[PDB]
Structure 1
Amino acid sequence: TWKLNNLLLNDYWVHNEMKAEIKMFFETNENKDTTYQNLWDAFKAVCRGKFIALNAYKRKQERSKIDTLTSQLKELEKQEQTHSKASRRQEITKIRAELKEIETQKTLQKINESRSWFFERINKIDRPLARLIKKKREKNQIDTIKNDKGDITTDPTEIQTTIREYYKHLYANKLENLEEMDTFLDTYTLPRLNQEEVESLNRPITGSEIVAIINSLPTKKSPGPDGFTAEFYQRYKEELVPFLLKLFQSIEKEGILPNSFYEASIILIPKPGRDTTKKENFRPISLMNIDAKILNKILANRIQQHIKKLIHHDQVGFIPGMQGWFNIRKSINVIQHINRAKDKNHMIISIDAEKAFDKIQQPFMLKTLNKLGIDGTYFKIIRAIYDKPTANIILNGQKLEAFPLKTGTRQGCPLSPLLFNIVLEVLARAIRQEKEIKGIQLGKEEVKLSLFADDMIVYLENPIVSAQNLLKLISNFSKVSGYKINVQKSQAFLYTNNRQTESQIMGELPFTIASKRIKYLGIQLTRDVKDLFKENYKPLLKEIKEETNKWKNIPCSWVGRINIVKMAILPKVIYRFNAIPIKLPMTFFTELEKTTLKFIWNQKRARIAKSILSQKNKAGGITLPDFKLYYKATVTKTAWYWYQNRDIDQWNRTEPSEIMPHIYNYLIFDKPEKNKQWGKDSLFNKWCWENWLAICRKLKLDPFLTPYTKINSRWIKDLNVKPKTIKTLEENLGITIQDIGVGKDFMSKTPKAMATKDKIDKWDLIKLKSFCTAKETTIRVNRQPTTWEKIFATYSSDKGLISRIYNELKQIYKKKTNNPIKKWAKDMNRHFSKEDIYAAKKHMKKCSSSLAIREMQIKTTMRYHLTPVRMAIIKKSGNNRCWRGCGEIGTLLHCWWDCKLVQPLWKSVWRFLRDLELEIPFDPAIPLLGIYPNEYKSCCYKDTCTRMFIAALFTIAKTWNQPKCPTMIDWIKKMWHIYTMEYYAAIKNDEFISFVGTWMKLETIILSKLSQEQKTKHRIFSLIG
């Protein structure tokens, strides 16, 4: 079955013919007999046909010469076989050689092209490095599977039948009781969209909307069953988008889809560590056509605008701007409340939904949309999409016969996640509204539910009544919706005053009772909150220790191993900090850093100090992750939510408020509080406050009255001013005291303020006039804000907040280090200006795109290499002399520059620079460090010199302790290797004008010095010419 191979899109001739036929198809074809839906499927057939014609022709053309020579040789060899003479064997000898020349040249090019691709990526956080740490990828092929007989089979036709029949049954059964659905939907109170909102859904599609979706499609994804890729639509969006608009407008008008929109391919993937004998162990994934995903993406974006009107904030899955940790922290706070309570009669239930996305009944889903008030053009298009979807299984690369999808949301569809949530919201609203299912009361807060997609946790009081009523309600929803739970797989914590009462409740209820812990949303919830460290963080250390112990022999430099820690370990560490930000002992961070460094330095002591790696200006932009500062950044981030004071944030309100509530709304940028007895038992919030204050005093800020203090603050409320005055000021003039104005500004700065000024209570204005015009209030409020203050006050989005705080903490907690560049300046008798030390650092960043070439320079500048001087100190044995055996003290400058065995190579390099006709002094700082004197700092040739010198550095380092000269031919070979890698990259990324500038003059010199014997032996020949 055909797929477009994306490489064809690159090729300027193939591209030109497609543009010709795309225009020519449509302008020929458009006549009033076809519907536009039929005309679109006809267009796709012609395109698929033409791509086959172009691929076949191109392959035939590229081979044409070897095709000819094979014939030409074969008749001459048969002419000899009939009539033999020596010159026929001469001719055979020549042509058969040229056959070998052509065939090897093609073999080289493919090997050099793949090497070039790897050369750009090596040691970078990219798919090659990701694959290195992963296991070997298990093949799709399925040899053997079991029958429901309890029997085992290997016959291909039996296994094809048994898989297909199983999936065909799951999707088959559509409910018919529509009258009973309407009753359930009427029973409860549900939201509605207003007119203005409904006008937004039903508005006509436009071209700008389509191109915005095309531009954002992910690249390198599998195509659907018609085999066109996202890269095709991106490439021809100029010609296609006019016709795509005509298609969607015809769908709006008529409610009819093209037949291809219904098709999908199901691929089966085996589950890890699971027994392939059983069909249940595979997981399906569905591939839909890209044109159908474009339409579905349009619809999902429209409904996403409204979704916060429809869905309560107890649901956080798939919702823009919500966080999964909101439910984790709320749940831990509920468990603490129960642990503290004197009378315990409570239950916490984690509910196991079964295959929820597949089992939703489509008629109930469409009725739900009407009750929320979605109807018209938007509802008509959604109804068309569910009219007749079908799937084909693809097993062992073989396409099985299709079956209808009569239940479920479409498993690979943009629109399915939100449609599932909207249906589940009907159940969530029923549970909240039923007063005989009792929630848990936390001061002014009641908590019943938290949801994440289909995952559900429930918090109940008086369980023996309350849990029975919950099960009844779910049974009723199951009948109409199709949604189903496995009650024995569901786990609960049960709290009772004594064990007789426990035995009774357990007798009646079906659930599995958990004694220590329950896995939830990636973490462990514990029955007592005192065990959070033991169940969450002690295991996380053990997991990282064993994971790095597996990797220890991977073929990777210290540069690549640093990137492994950032790629694999850092994300799971951050996730655990963000879910459970409890006070952690210092030993946790000591074990974590020791483990991580021991891996990076391959169990030998560090070659470069962690303090130099700490900072991005040093070591050419290679940097080591600081886990203490990521921890501190995560703990402090909570203060942003306190200042925002949002009603969606109920996780923040759920902590014990025994002494005094609401204190967190007042803390940030506001008057200090007399009493310290608040927050006595706080798990999260009291520790957040202590970290916030410590950073403010490290900055020597005054945190308590600021250019960002609110009008809704203790500062104003300690004045006795009526709440109507406060709300008047916010509604008219904005929310900061600075928006009022202090001192001479007090209202005068705008006419809107003095327009407001008359409106306020006579006596309140005198109180406010006194405070705002005082000397200290003017001084404190008028100062310029720091970048730290700007983070918490200014930003409307929580996005990016850990990375923003972490970059500040790096500047604040910065520490002093030795500089290797200074030691080099002592090693030579010279002083480097601050401008030279800057050039050394910039060169170390910009000498290459490849980390392979950059690493060699970084090691040279940062004094990586061992020397006999250093080695004699370590062994404390006084032989400090040069391993090469010239009879001299082996300083690092001797090893690189001065040794008489190395000196003939560096003189060779200087002969090439004179053939380039550059006049450059013979100074060790230019090749070793990239420090040019002031005349040459700007020059146009530095790109060339950088390649010559780094090639020479490789050549010396390869024989570091060997008693022989490095040789000119080894240097030429290394330099030509780099040339080859850069050439294929320069084509692939269309940089070729730059490449020719750098290499062209150097290439001419390298070729002029070699003999044809040497060029043949080492395959040195031009790729430009």
Structure 2
Amino acid sequence: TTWKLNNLLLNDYWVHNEMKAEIKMFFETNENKDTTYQNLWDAFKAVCRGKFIALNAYKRKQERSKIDTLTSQLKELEKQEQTHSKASRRQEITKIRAELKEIETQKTLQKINESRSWFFERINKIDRPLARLIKKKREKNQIDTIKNDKGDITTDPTEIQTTIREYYKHLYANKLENLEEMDTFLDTYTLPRLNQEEVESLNRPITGSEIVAIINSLPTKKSPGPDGFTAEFYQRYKEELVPFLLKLFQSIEKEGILPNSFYEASIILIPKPGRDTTKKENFRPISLMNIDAKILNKILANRIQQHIKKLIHHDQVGFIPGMQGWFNIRKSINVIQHINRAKDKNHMIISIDAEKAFDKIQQPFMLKTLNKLGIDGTYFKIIRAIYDKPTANIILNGQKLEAFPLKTGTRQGCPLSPLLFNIVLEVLARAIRQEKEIKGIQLGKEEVKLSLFADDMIVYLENPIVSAQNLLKLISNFSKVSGYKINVQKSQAFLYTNNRQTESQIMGELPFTIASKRIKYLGIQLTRDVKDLFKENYKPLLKEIKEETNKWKNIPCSWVGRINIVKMAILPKVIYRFNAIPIKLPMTFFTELEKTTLKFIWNQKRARIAKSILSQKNKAGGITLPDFKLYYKATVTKTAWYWYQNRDIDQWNRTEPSEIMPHIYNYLIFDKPEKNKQWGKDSLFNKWCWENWLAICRKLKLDPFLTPYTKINSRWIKDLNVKPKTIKTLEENLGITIQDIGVGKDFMSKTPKAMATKDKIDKWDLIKLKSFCTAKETTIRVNRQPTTWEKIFATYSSDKGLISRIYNELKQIYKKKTNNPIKKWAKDMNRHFSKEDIYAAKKHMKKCSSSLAIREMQIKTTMRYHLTPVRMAIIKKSGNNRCWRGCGEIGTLLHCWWDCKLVQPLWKSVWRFLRDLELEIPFDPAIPLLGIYPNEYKSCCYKDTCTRMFIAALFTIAKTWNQPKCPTMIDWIKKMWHIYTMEYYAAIKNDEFISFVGTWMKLETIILSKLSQEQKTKHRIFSLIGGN
């Protein structure tokens, strides 16, 4: 039983201070020059573990002191009664039993109330409860049925255990000592070498600021390593741990020896989805490292990520910051299309996946690669230190296995493992790119050979009968030195051949199974014929979404919960599909997706709130609603950003097939329009992107051709037949846009650097640039204030969050007129609401309470969600419009909520409660029903209390919506007490107690003063707060 740190223990103030004092005292009394700092850090970890155990035991003992004394007294009195029975002893025993039972009941009630409060704070939001409700039951780590060596099913725990441990020990024991072959392979091919500056950047001395940056970036709510310390321990005791962690890492840099804890890790076997559980090779051995080892490896990973852009080509986008997965997906789709349009089809596209990508990678080959990449000195010495004697023990069925060495492979679950694996696999990538014998597919003026995402490598070949053989020979050579293994049972290949004999020979020699219809690549069904992309990618997407809706039909969550479910689960999948393949989708797809989503949201019933109302911003609603057409436009127009940027790493841009003006995509945005050129007959992604960008620009009624962000390289300047050296000079000196050099009277005059730039340009081109720039049309078209749409694609140098900004701008642009239900409320009371009243009602809807249940109730009240006798009488085309619950009056919404003689006494009680709170609030239905206040009620010190009372009243009114019995004050008070308990524990957990007490103390005291003792005891209503 390995100890683990409980995060709730770190939130205790006394334990916090005691543990900080212990850390400081120990680490200033045990620090000396008679011992190394690695063993000192290990001893510090052991001492912290022991002190934490002692503190937890002390806390448990103190928390149960009163009950322990009571139970001791009860047992003693019971023994005395058994020996000699007395009446007073019986009375004392009964009283002690009653007190003990009351204390235990209070403790359990507090526990369940804390749990209910935590759930109620995130009842319908995008959070762990909703995702857990979506997901199936959590799979336990109890693997009990696994194939043995002799081919028979076994269930004996000892045999199961020994089979797993022996298999994984064998997996991590095969270390190759053929150093000469590795050196030869590295020397054969050319690899990048870091210069002196980058090497000194890697080997720079560690600073405490790096420790803080890494500690703050550590993910929370993650399982601790074998040492049992969580990331929260390092984040919370950060102030006293950065100096000693920094000194330990300095000792590591001077000596190169790591603490013994840095090596030990625990391997947890997750079953791989879509694979057979009973197979022992079908488990992913992730490793939980100590958070300090994770800190060191994350420092190292950041240091190498500083230069990962130079170390690794742009063909590889897995684990590489700043490049998306669809970079390779669109590129492969374009290559497939180019093959399909090829008159002679002699191409192959092999999707190769590495079997156990960096579980079979070689540490010696990795070290040799790092040496060959210029990585040497302190950084490489630390890298060699962390791979010196790795050791992992499998945590199997909750039992720690005896540890085995990691003589081979790279530990999974390590911050540095992806970067090092990418570095090692880049040797093979550059070998493939640099081997002229294997031929890539010549798309336009560029050659395309390979694209990588982690170990998912796709190779495009021409003349495959020799290219595939040479690629296999190269991969075998790489395997002989690095242990890289091809996952034959997952690797596939599209083989385009017009000769049956050559094709049959290729399947005869090639081990890859030739996919005839589709290849699953990064969750995307790459198609052999590119016209099948919609039918093999989006029709399955609709089928999957329909199945998920059918599975969630009986889910126990409301319409807000279902909207957030669609956002949390369905929406990312749709967005990923749109990003990977932004092909022109038929409107049938969007209508079907919207119908499925809306049927899911409203439980296959009629929509209570119009989808046009929810599709607006959160102002009209407060929870909004996904717009899949607008999201599709956002993803398809995001390519405009990559067009404008015109980066050298965007190969997926240039592989689009084209016959007229091949270099056109960089000259389309904020650039002169074509002369009705019929470019892009059959392009798949870029033509639709351009059409949608132009449509959006037309919708904005803005000129997208001559823009303040028009480049100097743009066709506007190029068509002047100016020398490209002038464009280079203007880009280097002044800037990249026309504004940077000025137009009109501002032509090369706003900056003294313009005078120097003028001397570097030919006078003919200077004259022509002056003539173009000082023209009236150019001056008015360029010297104008840019819009948000233009700023999205031009002023942002990073592609992070392009979809969100573009989608928000599109939701602003495509805003649709909707019928405001607040105006219907105004018509209901025969009174007029101003713009200020509408804003107040919408804001009250937005932030009546933090919890989404209270907000959902307020939204349903204000947005006329509830069903009424008048409305239902209309739907059934009957005449039963009489109010429910029985009054003889017409059942409008204002009647059901406010004016009914049955609900009216509840509102009179609410107003009495308001009255003894010294609140003079007018008897206006708008005040509770929508939160609309008179203009003179500017004071907000009573807003929250009134909101709580009114919304609890709405809750208890909806509780008995058509019930002939009238809503009562007691149920309203019970709902208020439930809300009070929830917000009390929420404030206790979220450190927001003062504001909660400010808006809940007087109301609670009046509740207690207006309730009898019998009601308080029966309904469990009592004060949770004191005098503070």
TM-score, scaled to structure 1: 0.98
Name 1:877's counterpart in structure 2.
Answer: 878
Q: For 1:842-861, what aligned pairs fall within 5 Å after superposition?
A: 842-861=843-862
Q: Structure 1 817/87 Cα, relative in aligned 2: closer, same or farther at 3 Å?
A: same
SS of the residue 2:671 aligns to: coil
Conserved 8 A contact 1:449-1:459? yes
| Larger CA deviation: 462-471 vs 563-572 | 462-471
Report the alpha carbon displacement of residue 229 of structure 1 after superposing the two structures with TM: 0.9
Distance (Å, rounded) in 2 between the aligned partners of 1:725 and 1:402: 67
Name 1:244's counterpart in structure 2.
Answer: 245
Conserved 8 A contact 1:266-1:391? yes
Q: Structure 1 760/139 Cα, relative in aligned 2: closer, same or farther at 3 Å?
A: closer
| Larger CA deviation: 484-493 vs 1-10 | 484-493
Conserved 8 A contact 2:712-2:731? yes
Structure 1's unaligned 5+ residue stretches are none
Conserved 8 A contact 1:619-1:862? no
Conserved 8 A contact 1:343-1:497? yes
SS of the residue 1:619 aligns to: coil
Name 2:708's counterpart in structure 1.
Answer: 707
Report the alpha carbon displacement of residue 548 of structure 1 after superposing the two structures with TM: 0.1
Q: Structure 1 275/645 Cα, relative in aligned 2: closer, same or farther at 3 Å?
A: closer
Report the alpha carbon displacement of residue 617 of structure 1 after superposing the two structures with TM: 4.1
SS of the residue 2:936 aligns to: helix
Distance (Å, rounded) in 1 between the aligned partners of 2:323 and 2:78: 77
Distance (Å, rounded) in 1 between the aligned partners of 2:72 and 2:770: 103
Question: Residues 238-295 of structure 1, C-alpha deviation per residue, up to 9 Å, x if partnerless?
Answer: 1111111111111111111111111001112334565544323333221111111111
Distance (Å, rounded) in 2 between the aligned partners of 1:488 and 1:103: 58
Conserved 8 A contact 1:255-1:384? yes
| Larger CA deviation: 885-894 vs 202-211 | 885-894
Report the alpha carbon displacement of residue 1021 of structure 1 after superposing the two structures with TM: 1.6
SS of the residue 1:984 aligns to: helix
Report the alpha carbon displacement of residue 906 of structure 1 after superposing the two structures with TM: 1.6
Q: Structure 1 366/901 Cα, relative in aligned 2: closer, same or farther at 3 Å?
A: same
User: CA RMSD, aligned part only?
Assistant: 1.7
Q: Structure 1 203/901 Cα, relative in aligned 2: closer, same or farther at 3 Å?
A: same
Conserved 8 A contact 2:336-2:528? yes
Distance (Å, rounded) in 1 between the aligned partners of 2:1005 and 2:839: 34
Q: Structure 1 34/915 Cα, relative in aligned 2: closer, same or farther at 3 Å?
A: same
Q: Structure 1 270/191 Cα, relative in aligned 2: closer, same or farther at 3 Å?
A: closer
Report the alpha carbon displacement of residue 619 of structure 1 after superposing the two structures with TM: 4.8
Distance (Å, rounded) in 2 between the aligned partners of 1:338 and 1:829: 70
SS of the residue 2:654 aligns to: coil
| Larger CA deviation: 608-617 vs 274-283 | 274-283
Conserved 8 A contact 2:671-2:715? yes
Q: Structure 1 38/78 Cα, relative in aligned 2: closer, same or farther at 3 Å?
A: closer
Report the alpha carbon displacement of residue 476 of structure 1 after superposing the two structures with TM: 1.6
Conserved 8 A contact 2:256-2:381? yes
Distance (Å, rounded) in 2 between the aligned partners of 1:74 and 1:635: 75
Q: Structure 1 1012/798 Cα, relative in aligned 2: closer, same or farther at 3 Å?
A: same
Report the alpha carbon displacement of residue 488 of structure 1 after superposing the two structures with TM: 6.4
| Larger CA deviation: 129-138 vs 508-517 | 508-517
Conserved 8 A contact 1:264-1:390? yes
Q: Structure 1 701/78 Cα, relative in aligned 2: closer, same or farther at 3 Å?
A: closer
Conserved 8 A contact 1:853-1:950? yes
Question: Residues 636-668 of structure 1, C-alpha deviation per residue, up to 9 Å, x if partnerless?
Answer: 111111111111111111122212221222211
Distance (Å, rounded) in 2 between the aligned partners of 1:1022 and 1:489: 63
Q: Structure 1 503/525 Cα, relative in aligned 2: closer, same or farther at 3 Å?
A: same
Report the alpha carbon displacement of residue 927 of structure 1 after superposing the two structures with TM: 1.6
Report the alpha carbon displacement of residue 840 of structure 1 after superposing the two structures with TM: 1.0
Name 2:83's counterpart in structure 1.
Answer: 82
Q: Structure 1 827/447 Cα, relative in aligned 2: closer, same or farther at 3 Å?
A: same
SS of the residue 2:973 aligns to: helix
Question: Residues 44-94 of structure 1, C-alpha deviation per residue, up to 9 Å, x if partnerless?
Answer: 111111111111122112222222222323333333434333333222222
SS of the residue 2:494 aligns to: strand
SS of the residue 1:518 aligns to: strand
Distance (Å, rounded) in 1 between the aligned partners of 2:674 and 2:573: 38
Question: Residues 800-856 of structure 1, C-alpha deviation per residue, up to 9 Å, x if partnerless?
Answer: 111111111111111111111111111112111111111111111121111111111
Q: Structure 1 182/12 Cα, relative in aligned 2: closer, same or farther at 3 Å?
A: same
| Larger CA deviation: 592-601 vs 993-1002 | 993-1002
SS of the residue 1:348 aligns to: strand
Conserved 8 A contact 1:267-1:393? yes
| Larger CA deviation: 852-861 vs 738-747 | 738-747
SS of the residue 2:414 aligns to: coil
Distance (Å, rounded) in 1 between the aligned partners of 2:456 and 2:365: 20
Question: Residues 754-791 of structure 1, C-alpha deviation per residue, up to 9 Å, x if partnerless?
Answer: 22223322322222222222222222221111111111
Distance (Å, rounded) in 2 between the aligned partners of 1:219 and 1:651: 36
Distance (Å, rounded) in 2 between the aligned partners of 1:929 and 1:183: 78
Distance (Å, rounded) in 1 between the aligned partners of 2:312 and 2:834: 63
Distance (Å, rounded) in 2 between the aligned partners of 1:320 and 1:167: 32
Report the alpha carbon displacement of residue 99 of structure 1 after superposing the two structures with TM: 2.0
Distance (Å, rounded) in 2 between the aligned partners of 1:905 and 1:748: 75
Question: Residues 473-495 of structure 1, C-alpha deviation per residue, up to 9 Å, x if partnerless?
Answer: 22222111111224565322222
Conserved 8 A contact 1:619-1:858? no
Conserved 8 A contact 1:612-1:618? no
Question: Residues 734-765 of structure 1, C-alpha deviation per residue, up to 9 Å, x if partnerless?
Answer: 22222222222222222211222233223222
TM-score, scaled to structure 2: 0.97
Conserved 8 A contact 1:352-1:489? yes
Distance (Å, rounded) in 1 between the aligned partners of 2:98 and 2:115: 26
Conserved 8 A contact 1:488-1:510? no
Distance (Å, rounded) in 1 between the aligned partners of 2:272 and 2:786: 54
Distance (Å, rounded) in 1 between the aligned partners of 2:642 and 2:351: 28
Conserved 8 A contact 2:658-2:683? no
Conserved 8 A contact 2:618-2:846? no
Q: Structure 1 867/250 Cα, relative in aligned 2: closer, same or farther at 3 Å?
A: same
Q: Structure 1 71/344 Cα, relative in aligned 2: closer, same or farther at 3 Å?
A: closer
Report the alpha carbon displacement of residue 620 of structure 1 after superposing the two structures with TM: 4.0
Conserved 8 A contact 1:123-1:851? yes
Q: Structure 1 986/498 Cα, relative in aligned 2: closer, same or farther at 3 Å?
A: same
| Larger CA deviation: 385-394 vs 749-758 | 749-758
Conserved 8 A contact 1:620-1:842? no
Report the alpha carbon displacement of residue 27 of structure 1 after superposing the two structures with TM: 2.1
Conserved 8 A contact 1:391-1:405? yes
| Larger CA deviation: 143-152 vs 998-1007 | 143-152
| Larger CA deviation: 244-253 vs 88-97 | 88-97
Q: Structure 1 465/94 Cα, relative in aligned 2: closer, same or farther at 3 Å?
A: closer
Conserved 8 A contact 1:214-1:294? yes
Q: Structure 1 1000/132 Cα, relative in aligned 2: closer, same or farther at 3 Å?
A: same
Q: Structure 1 446/978 Cα, relative in aligned 2: closer, same or farther at 3 Å?
A: same
Conserved 8 A contact 2:225-2:291? yes
Distance (Å, rounded) in 2 between the aligned partners of 1:823 and 1:102: 53
Conserved 8 A contact 2:614-2:621? no
Percentage of pairs with the same residue: 100
User: Aligned pairs, how many?
Assistant: 1025
Q: Structure 1 221/510 Cα, relative in aligned 2: closer, same or farther at 3 Å?
A: closer
SS of the residue 2:358 aligns to: helix
SS of the residue 2:359 aligns to: helix
Conserved 8 A contact 1:261-1:292? yes
SS of the residue 1:358 aligns to: coil
Distance (Å, rounded) in 1 between the aligned partners of 2:1004 and 2:779: 71
Distance (Å, rounded) in 2 between the aligned partners of 1:778 and 1:71: 93
Q: Structure 1 736/156 Cα, relative in aligned 2: closer, same or farther at 3 Å?
A: closer
Name 1:528's counterpart in structure 2.
Answer: 529
SS of the residue 1:936 aligns to: coil
Report the alpha carbon displacement of residue 154 of structure 1 after superposing the two structures with TM: 3.4
Distance (Å, rounded) in 2 between the aligned partners of 1:786 and 1:831: 36
Report the alpha carbon displacement of residue 993 of structure 1 after superposing the two structures with TM: 1.2
Distance (Å, rounded) in 1 between the aligned partners of 2:144 and 2:699: 66
Conserved 8 A contact 2:286-2:411? no
Question: Residues 967-1001 of structure 1, C-alpha deviation per residue, up to 9 Å, x if partnerless?
Answer: 12222211111111111111111111112221211
Conserved 8 A contact 1:317-1:324? yes
Q: Structure 1 488/994 Cα, relative in aligned 2: closer, same or farther at 3 Å?
A: closer
SS of the residue 2:803 aligns to: helix
Conserved 8 A contact 1:361-1:408? yes
Conserved 8 A contact 2:619-2:843? no
SS of the residue 1:651 aligns to: helix
